[PDB]
Structure formats: structure tokens, C-alpha cells
Write a protein that binds this DNA or RNA. Structure first.
Ligand SMILES: [Mg+2]
Length: 1037
RNA sequence: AGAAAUCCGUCUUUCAUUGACGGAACAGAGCAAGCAGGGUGACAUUAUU
DNA sequence: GCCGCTTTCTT
DNA sequence: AATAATGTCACCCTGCTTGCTCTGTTGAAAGCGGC
DNA sequence: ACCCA
């Protein structure tokens, strides 16, 4: 089978005033018709029966809840605009049972008990269906009969069975001549009876073709006429007759197809209310037009069906969450846990939900055992817990809660305490959970065959300026009600460059004239002579480069074979153009010669890729069941040049320290002039010279962008206590920092550090507004107040946020492009990546959550997933569980293999942070990764002959003054490695070195460490290799 | 069928009328968190009397 | 063959 | 025994901000009559 | 576990 993809383009229409009136009026007409279809289909779907759902559900492998599918169509949370029969939440179960003739399911209970937003109210759509029957003047059962026909013909979507596009318009209201269904039904059943009791099953299709022709009394040239009356798209049976007599025959496939045809054409389309419905629609919309009625129907039907499907799934998920909540409801331990706030440790006035992460989670057990281990005197067992449970990611537990839980350890078990906390937060999430309202929405309308084909375009090409217009030929509705086609232009130099410009190449032939699809435009020259308005030069440049290419006979012509292009337009005049293109044949399973890759996402370092190949002989991998060979690894990079100099937009950290003295200087000059104020417990003002903080920032010689982020924090600190008068000089300093020289509005890469810098600058302006307007708990301040006080600076707030948004969008796009070019350059057909990565949650520290919000791991994954099929590259999502620590080609080849990560530190640079990490890893005698870090330190001590230090390391605590200082350990390693510049390998979490069994990273070199031969590899490249060699899917397998 | 238009964006103490470059989009609903001030409440380190 | 309409299609 | 510096953790508030997921859409393929 | 001082 032939796999394809979709690219799209997007711009704004530029009609003249007359055609603009026509277009806006037509769109308003379509929108009014869409609203009418929305209300009417709301009622119609309120009319469905359990039989209709059963018939639409019957052939589905997963069993379906017919009652829930009825409920999500009979009762809908809605906006005021489609609210016709308001029903109180209290009577939902009663009225549902009345309609269903049976007691409500528990999932339906959960659907009805769910919260809905402020502006949505429950609507009884079955009552609306009854009133619609009255409005049409037809009996309820007659409209139900027509509804059965519509759902049977797939004109409407019911449950898991989707609609067939907009065929409802042609089927119910069409003016033309229909199929002869009885002929088809009879022929189909007699061939199925001719083909289900064969005494020999042929391996080719020819005897079957002969049987079908004999059954239909037809030849191969007449079969379409005989079977379908020459009407409609070719059926499965026609295509079967058409194929070469030598193709392999699939009996089960053909029988399945014939069964579908028999099922779908066993009954007539014998309408009862066809003409009433058609008069109703024509009266409440416009006169019959298949396309316009289709557009109205599409908008309304899509809205309703997505909401009802979502509510079905949501109700089932809600029932499961409720069952879980009811299981953990041990109810006396729950109340002891929550009696904390009434106990004598909570000295506060405002309570909060006690969560599992407030209790140290799993590790609570350890605390428990210590209490029964060393009772009566607890407290230091509490702090050993807390101190061993510090992370830069996880929220740390609350002391007073642990203290209080000592008081009830004898009766409430750790099992049940954690169960109670989990119950707490689950219940909280469950009361908050909201059902989904049905709303028409703001989607635009699609004109079919809307774009003038590029070869038929009307070009007013000047020798020094190409015609850059693309014209739509749209049907528009005039005030008298007649339709007429009109020409409307628009500009899109991307669409012009990739598709629309006329190509004149003898041999160049490509899908899209863009670098990632293999085409590079020729460069401009000194004889190019661009002279346009400034706000047009970039677009102009593109035009020029196309002109030159046509001038050289070098511009390729699109090989896409476009016969029609649609255009989607909204009320704002925006136009969207989709282009479907074939990407090639659907790949089979891995064979020898297929190349695959994996990629690793990081936030302070580059993303990494690892490229592998399936081979005939060599390294066997059990999980893959084949021989593999490592090709190469690399950093994911997106480089642009400035007058010869290269910059990686994804990772550039800015100028080195000695390079930005002047900038630094001005900051210094400002900060000498100011102090930082602060309020003492006893309220009193305490000041500090603000320049000490600046010196602390400078001492470690940061690069420009970290320096700007830290200086932004310092400016925010300076702003805090000031008067209105002080805030004005500080304001000139703020503007100068933001806009001149190296401020964020002029300099900054796409790196994570730059995004954090911009957010810190926004923090400065926020603090300025809060200080100026005297914000407090008793005086919340607002945006209107902020704009009233200082519109310029408020506008910067918005501008900085827009800068961040554009940076992140560009960065996701560039990361995906870089990986895709790596794959295309190395003929990689398979990409594999973590669909697992964290976003944010309560149990995580706020700073980690904020960084993850700027990290966009999910966005990068989704972008790779969007781009890869455009080159017939298959992406698989996988779990990231332990992918930073597995030993490539050893792990699960055949058993688990894991090692810690390492850092290369000069012996010189080994401080107390190193000793802290050594001590901490040496007590890391725990499950998970810590095992491997404990091992690590062991090897370290063995490799550097530092066993005698071990005990000093185990007692190293960040408080102790008896701690072994760092210079002992530096002196020992200097003794042994010869000098103070010598690299020492220290086992550290997040280290960039991995000691690998095999050469699994480009540039890795072999060493012997603790008498084991190992490859010193980029740890991120190793993680990418692990991801590449993963085979089991995200959830489990 | 009407000569205009950056389609949307990125980088650089370099801002470019020949600098180097990147991108399927859209709608609604829902979920998750962040920030600035202001408050509460634990702990730790410094020192001291 | 184009344009604009119809219909059926289980790929 | 405290008081106070300075610093790290958590938990609230009002009003603003963004990332991500769900369920979809942007039709396919043939013949007709009038040009 | 991913993410990192
Ligand atoms: Mg990594």
C-alpha cells in the first residue's frame, strides 16, 4: 500500500471591496446554516434508540456500552445558544431511565454527576427530538424510521461507526437518480453462495472472476454496467473483476467485503419524512446547494460527534477513578490523617490537601520501621529521612505532618497512611473533573477545487518582477440568492516557492522545492539589485531567487500531479491550503540493510541521535531478534552563519566573559547606586548593597546569557521595596537592560537558558508593577491597573511573552528538521524516541516544573511524529525507563545490564560538592538507579586506591565541621595522576560520561578502569543508543 | 482576474535591499502547571550575649 | 477534455 | 537559655501566563449533459 | 525513569 502525507499553506485573502462583501456575506450564510444544523442535529441525535446503537456497534471487536452511548446523545452539556430543553442535574438519572426503560448504568451515573463549566447547562436532547417531530408535523416513529435509515447508511456517525463525509446531503436531499439496490443485493448474495462451498480454493483470482461474471451474466467489459448501472465510484467487486487474472486470491477478504455489502444493502432507503425535512432545512437555511448544505452539516456534525465520543470515554474513565477512590477509603485512617489540621502541629489558619508527596511517599515505610526500630526518641530518624530525600526535582515532605504521624504510628499503618493520602488527592481531582459541553465552534469552510492550477495560472510576469499572486476561483452567493464564481488573489511566497511558481527544468523534478525535500534555490549576486519597501525585502529576496532559477533554466517543476486544490476560509479572510502527497510504499518489517535510529532529549545539553543498521553477520540483539551494527552518533544541531562564523541556535550560550566587559560595566555602574531592602520578622527594614550580589554573579565568569538571567533576578530584587520616585530611575535602567546591546530583545539563542532569561526579565517587570501598585493579599491588582499605570512597560510584558512563544515554536521546528536531515542523509527509515517524558505535576518542585514547561519534550516528539511520515520514516514511541543507564548491546542481551553515569573533573576542581556526591552515592544502598551509583563509588575507590578514605566519606554530612576536607582527596589524586590538571572520573547523577562495554558512540576511546576494559562514551549518545535498541512500546509492550 | 505582497518565524554586542536559515494547518472542549507581590508555618546556618 | 453537477464508495 | 542575620523548604490568596491531550476536519472516484 | 547542581 501507498502511504501519503499532508503539507499545508496559510495566508490572508485580499479581495477587492465588492468581492469582499460577497465573500463575507457567503461566510455569514454558511455560519448561520451551521448553527441551524447544530441545533437540528442535536435534536436528531437525541432521537437515537438502543437498537440503532446496537446495529451500529454489532460487528465491533470491543464490546460497547449501548446505554452510555444513548446517554451521551440524549443529554448534553451545552451553551445557551443550543439550550432548548433545560433539565436540572437532579432529574438526569430519572429521565434517562424513563427514556431507556431500565435502571441507569454506573458509568452513566458518573457522566451525570460530573461538573460542567459555568456557562453550560444540561440539555435534554430527547425532549428536543420530540419537539422537532412536532415542528416538522411528523409522527415520532416515522422520524425514528428515517433516523434508522440515516444511521444505517452511515450518513450520521453513531458510536464507533463514523459518518461517510457529507453523503447525507446527497442521500437525503439529492435530486439525482439512485442506484438499483436490488440488483446489487441479489448478485452479491448469489456470488457469496457460489464461493463459500468451493471444493478447491484457487490460488489465483481468475476462476473467481469467471464465477462472478457467470453469476452476474456479464463479461469483464460489461460488469460495471450490469452490477452498478455505470453509477458511482467503482465497488470492491468491480476492482476485483478488473485485476490481472494471475494475482493471488484471498478468500476471507472477499467474503468479508461481500458480507459488508450484503449488510449495508439489505434494506431500502424508504423515507417517511424526507420531504418535510428538506422543506425544514430549505426554510431555515438557503435554497438547496449540495456543497453549502454539506459545509453546514460538516461543521455541526463534527462538533457534536467529537463531544459525544469524548464524553463516552470520559464517563468510563470516571467510573474507574471512582472505584479506585472507593477502594482506598479506609475512612478512619483517612480521618486521622486529616485530623492533623485540628491537631497541635498545624499552627496555621488555612488547610490544604495532604498528598502522598507530603509524606515522603514509599519511603514512609522506612521512617515507620525506624520508629519501631528506635522508638521514644524519634525526630532524628525523621531528619535522616528528609535529608536523604532531597532532590532537585521531587517535593520534599512536610516535617509537622511526619511529626504528627508519629503520634498515630501505633494504630495507622504506613500502608494505610499512604493509601489515605492517595485517596485525598484522587478525590480532589475527581470532584473537580468536568464533562465536555457540545458547542458549534469556529472552524472555517472549505471550497473544493478552489485554486487556479499552476499551469493554468494568469501570470503578469515582468522581466524584473515575477507575478506573485495566487488566485482562488470561489463560488459566492449574491443578495438575490444566486451563486457565481469570482477570482480572489492572495500572496504566499512559501507556496509560490515550493509549488506555484512555474518550473522550467530539463531534469529537476521534486515534490516540494525546499531544502528538506532536496532542492536549494540559487544564491543572489551583485547583479541582483533589489529595491523595494523595507518591510518587503525578505519576501522580495525569495522572489528574486526564484526569478534567477527560472532565468537559469534551473527551477524544478513539481512532480505532484495536482488536479484540484481546496481552500479553507474563515470569517477573518484567512485561507488555508492543504496539499496531499504520496510518500511511498508502506514499509514491512526490518530486513538486512534497514537502518534505524534513536534520539535522546536533554535540557542543558544538546539532543543526541544514534544510528544503527541491521546486518547479515555480527552483533546479535535478542530484543530485536537480529544482527545490528552501530553506525554513528551525534548532537542535534541547527547552525546559521554570520559573516562566516557559525552559531548553533539550539545551544549557543552567548559571548564568553572577557568579551562582554562594556555591557557588564554598565550593569555594575547601575548596581553600585542602589541597595536591596527587606522586611525583618519584627517589621523593620534591612538593606544590603546590591553590588555584593553582582560581584557574586561575576566571580564565576558566566557566559552572556546566564549573566543576563542572573542580572534580571538582581534587578527584580532591587525593585522590591522602592518608592514611586525610585522606580523611575530604576525604570530607565530596566528599559536599557531590555532593549540595548545584549538585552533579550536583541540577543539570545533558542537555548533553554535564553528562554529562562526572558522569563526572568518578565519577572522584573511584574515586580515593578506589583511594587508600584502596592499589591497585597487584601489588594489584588489587575491588568487594567497595570496598563493604566504604565502602558509602555505592560506592552513589553506582552512582547517578551511573544518572543518566548516564537522562540519555542522555531526551536521545535528546527530540532525536528535537524533530526530529519540526519535521517535522510543516512537513509534511516525508523526513528524511535521517548513518548514517556515528564511534563509537570504537584509532586515536583516548582523550578523543575517551570523548566520542564520551557523544555517542550512532548512538543519535540510530536513534531518529529508530524515530519517523519512526510519522508516515509516510521516513528515509534517508547518508554524512557532506565534508558540513561542501560549498557547498549548488553542490557537484555540476554539479562539486565546497568551502570551509573560519570563526570570528568580535574583534580584541581574537586570541591566539597564532589565529596557530597561521593558520600551520598556511597549511602545509596537502595533499589532503582542508586544500586549502580553505589557500585560506582566502590569502583572509584578501588581504581584510585582510596579505599582507606571510605569511612570518612560515609560520615561526610553537609553540616559537619569534622568533615574530611576536599584538599585531602585532591592531594591523593594529584599524587596518583601526576599533576593538578589530571582528569578524574567521579560517579555523578546526570554526568555526561558513560563507561560502556562496547564502542557505541562516535569518538569513544578505550580505557581500563578498575581493571575493566570500557569505552568512555558521551552518556547522551549512549542513552540515544538505548532508545534506538528499545523494542517495547510506551505503556508496557 | 485587480501590481501588488514580508504566509509565519529564527539566529548575531555582526541586524544584513546579494548575511545565514527553519515550519502541515485549524476548531472546540478538557487537563496540567507557572509567575509577581502579599500572607502563613517548619527547618538550617551564621553569629552572638 | 473542461465545467459543474450527480451518484456511490467498505480499498 | 535566647535574638537576629540569611538562607533553604513547604502551604494559601488574586489575576494573569503557557504546555499538553482528546477528537476531529481540510474526500475519492466514476459518469452525465452542455460547452 | 526521564530531566540536573
Ligand atoms: Mg540524556
Amino acid at each position: 500500500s501507498m502511504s501519503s502525507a499532508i503539507k499545508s499553506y496559510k495566508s490572508v485573502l485580499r479581495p477587492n471591496e465588492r468581492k469582499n462583501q460577497l465573500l463575507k456575506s457567503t461566510i455569514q450564510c454558511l455560519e448561520d446554516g451551521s448553527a441551524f444544523f447544530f441545533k437540528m442535529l442535536q435534536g436528531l441525535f437525541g432521537g437515537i434508540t438502543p437498537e440503532i446503537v446496537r446495529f451500529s456497534t454489532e460487528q465491533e471487536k470491543q464490546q460497547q456500552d449501548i446505554a452510555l452511548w444513548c446517554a451521551v446523545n440524549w443529554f448534553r452539556p451545552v451553551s445557551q445558544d443550543s439550550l432548548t430543553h433545560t433539565i436540572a442535574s437532579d432529574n438526569l438519572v430519572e429521565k434517562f431511565e424513563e427514556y431507556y426503560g431500565g435502571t441507569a448504568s454506573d458509568a452513566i451515573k458518573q457522566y451525570f454527576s460530573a461538573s460542567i463549566g459555568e456557562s453550560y447547562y444540561w440539555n435534554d436532547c430527547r425532549q428536543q427530538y420530540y419537539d422537532l417531530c412536532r415542528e416538522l408535523g411528523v409522527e415520532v416513529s416515522d422520524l425514528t424510521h428515517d433516523l434508522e435509515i440515516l444511521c444505517r447508511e452511515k450518513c450520521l456517525a453513531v458510536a464507533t461507526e463514523s459518518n461517510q463525509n457529507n453523503s447525507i446531503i446527497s442521500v437525503l436531499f439529492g435530486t439525482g437518480e439512485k442506484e438499483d439496490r436490488s440488483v446489487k443485493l441479489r448478485i452479491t448474495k448469489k456470488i457469496l453462495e457460489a464461493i463459500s462451498n468451493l471444493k478447491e480454493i484457487p490460488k489465483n483470482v481468475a476462476p473467481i472472476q469467471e464465477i462472478i461474471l457467470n453469476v452476474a451474466k456479464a463479461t469483464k467489459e460489461t460488469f460495471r454496467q450490469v452490477y452498478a448501472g455505470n453509477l458511482g465510484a467503482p465497488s470492491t467487486l468491480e476492482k476485483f473483476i478488473a485485476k490481472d487474472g494471475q494475482k493471488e486470491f484471498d478468500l476471507k477478504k472477499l467474503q468479508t467485503d461481500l458480507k459488508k455489502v450484503i449488510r449495508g444493502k439489505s434494506k431500502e432507503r424508504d423515507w417517511c419524512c424526507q420531504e418535510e425535512l428538506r422543506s425544514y432545512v430549505e426554510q431555515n437555511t438557503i435554497q438547496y446547494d449540495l456543497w453549502a448544505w454539506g459545509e453546514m452539516f460538516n461543521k455541526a456534525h463534527t462538533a457534536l460527534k467529537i463531544k459525544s465520543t469524548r464524553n463516552y470515554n470520559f464517563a468510563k474513565q470516571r467510573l474507574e477513578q471512582f472505584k479506585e477512590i472507593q477502594s482506598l477509603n479506609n475512612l478512619l485512617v483517612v480521618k486521622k490523617l486529616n485530623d492533623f489540621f485540628d491537631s497541635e502541629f498545624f499552627s496555621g489558619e488555612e488547610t490544604y490537601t495532604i498528598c502522598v508527596h507530603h509524606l515522603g511517599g514509599k519511603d514512609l515505610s522506612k521512617l515507620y520501621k525506624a520508629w519501631e526500630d528506635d522508638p521514644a526518641d524519634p525526630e532524628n530518624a525523621i531528619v535522616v529521612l528528609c535529608d536523604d530525600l532531597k532532590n532537585n526535582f521531587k517535593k520534599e515532605p512536610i516535617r509537622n505532618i511526619l511529626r504528627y504521624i508519629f503520634t498515630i504510628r501505633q494504630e495507622c499503618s504506613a500502608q494505610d497512611i499512604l493509601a489515605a493520602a492517595k485517596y485525598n488527592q484522587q478525590l480532589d481531582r475527581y470532584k473537580s473533573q468536568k464533562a465536555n459541553p457540545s458547542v458549534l465552534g469556529n472552524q472555517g469552510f472549505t471550497w473544493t477545487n478552489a485554486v487556479i492550477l499552476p499551469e493554468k495560472a494568469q501570470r503578469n510576469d515582468r522581466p524584473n518582477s515575477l507575478d506573485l499572486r495566487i488566485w482562488l476561483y470561489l463560488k459566492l452567493r449574491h443578495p438575490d440568492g444566486r451563486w457565481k464564481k469570482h477570482h480572489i488573489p492572495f500572496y504566499d511566497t512559501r507556496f509560490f516557492q515550493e509549488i506555484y511558481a512555474a518550473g522550467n527544468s530539463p531534469v529537476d523534478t521534486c515534490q516540494f522545492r525546499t531544502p528538506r525535500f532536496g532542492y536549494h534555490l540559487p544564491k543572489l549576486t551583485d547583479q541582483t539589485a533589489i529595491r523595494v519597501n523595507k518591510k518587503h525585502v525578505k519576501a522580495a529576496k525569495t522572489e528574486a531567487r526564484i526569478r534567477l532559477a527560472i532565468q537559469q533554466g534551473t527551477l524544478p517543476v513539481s512532480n505532484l500531479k495536482i488536479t484540484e486544490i481546496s481552500a479553507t476560509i474563515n470569517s477573518k479572510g484567512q485561507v488555508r491550503i492543504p496539499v496531499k502527497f504520496d510518500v511511498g510504499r508502506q514499509k514491512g518489517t526490518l530486513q538486512i540493510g534497514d537502518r534505524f535510529c534513536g534520539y535522546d532529549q536533554n535540557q542543558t545539553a544538546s539532543h543526541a541521535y544514534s544510528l544503527w543498521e541491521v546486518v547479515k553477520e555480527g552483533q546479535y540483539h535478542k530484543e530485536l531478534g537480529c544482527f545490528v551494527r552501530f553506525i554513528s552518533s551525534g548532537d542535534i544541531v541547527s547552525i546559521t552563519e554570520n559573516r562566516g562564523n557559525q552559531f548553533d541556535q539550539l545551544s549557543y550560550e552567548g559571548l564568553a566573559y572577557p568579551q562582554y566587559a562594556d555591557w557588564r560595566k554598565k550593569a555594575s555602574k547601575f548596581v553600585s547606586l542602589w541597595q536591596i531592602t527587606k522586611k525583618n520578622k519584627k517589621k523593620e527594614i534591612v538593606t544590603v548593597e546590591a553590588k555584593e550580589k553582582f560581584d557574586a554573579i561575576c566571580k564565576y565568569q558566566p557566559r552572556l546569557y546566564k549573566f543576563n538571567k542572573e542580572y534580571a533576578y538582581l534587578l527584580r530584587d532591587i525593585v522590591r521595596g522602592k518608592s514611586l520616585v525610585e522606580l523611575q530611575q530604576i525604570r530607565q535602567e530596566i528599559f536599557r537592560f531590555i532593549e540595548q546591546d545584549c538585552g533579550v530583545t536583541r540577543l539570545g539563542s533558542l537555548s533553554l537558558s535564553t528562554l529562562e532569561t526572558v522569563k526572568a526579565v518578565k519577572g522584573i517587570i511584574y515586580s515593578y508593577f506589583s511594587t508600584a501598585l502596592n499589591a497585597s493579599k487584601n489588594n489584588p491588582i489587575s491588568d487594567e491597573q497595570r496598563k493604566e499605570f504604565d502602558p509602555e512597560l505592560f506592552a513589553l510584558l506582552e512582547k517578551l511573552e511573544l518572543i518566548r512563544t516564537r522562540k519555542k515554536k522555531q526551536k521545535v521546528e528546527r530540532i525536528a528538521n535537524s533530526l530529519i536531515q540526519t535521517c535522510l542523509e543516512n537513509n534511516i527509515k525508523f526513528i524511535r524516541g521517548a513518548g514517556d517524558l515528564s511534563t509537570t505535576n504537584n509532586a515536583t518542585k516548582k523550578k523543575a516544573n517551570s523548566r520542564s514547561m520551557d523544555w517542550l519534550a512532548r512538543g519535540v516528539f510530536n513534531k518529529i511524529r508530524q515530519l517523519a511520515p512526510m519522508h516515509n520514516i516510521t516513528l515509534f514511541g517508547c518508554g524512557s525507563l532506565y534508558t540513561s543507564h542501560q549498557d547498549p548491546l548488553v542490557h537484555r542481551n540476554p539479562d539486565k545490564a546497568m551502570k551509573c553515569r560519570w563526570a570528568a573533573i580535574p583534580v584541581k576542581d574537586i570541591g566539597d560538592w564532589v565529596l557530597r556526591k561521593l558520600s551520598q552515592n556511597l549511602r545509596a544502598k537502595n533499589i532503582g538507579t542508586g544500586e549502580y551509583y553505589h557500585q560506582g563509588v566502590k569502583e572509584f575507590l578501588s581504581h584510585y586506591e582510596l579505599q582507606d578514605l571510605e569511612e570518612e566519606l560515609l560520615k561526610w554530612r553537609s553540616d559537619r565541621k569534622s568533615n574530611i576536607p576536599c584538599w585531602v582527596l585532591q592531594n591523593r589524586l594529584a599524587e596518583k595522576l601526576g599533576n593538578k590538571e589530571a582528569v578524574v572520573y567521579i560517579p555523578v547523577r546526570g554526568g555526561r560520561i558513560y563507561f560502556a562495554t562496547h564502542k557505541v558512540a562516535t569518538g569513544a576511546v578505550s580505557i581500563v578502569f578498575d581493571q575493566k576494559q570500557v569505552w568512555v562514551c558521551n552518556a547522551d549518545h549512549v542513552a540515544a543508543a538505548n532508545i534506538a535498541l528499545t523494542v517495547k512500546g510506551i505503556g508496557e509492550q
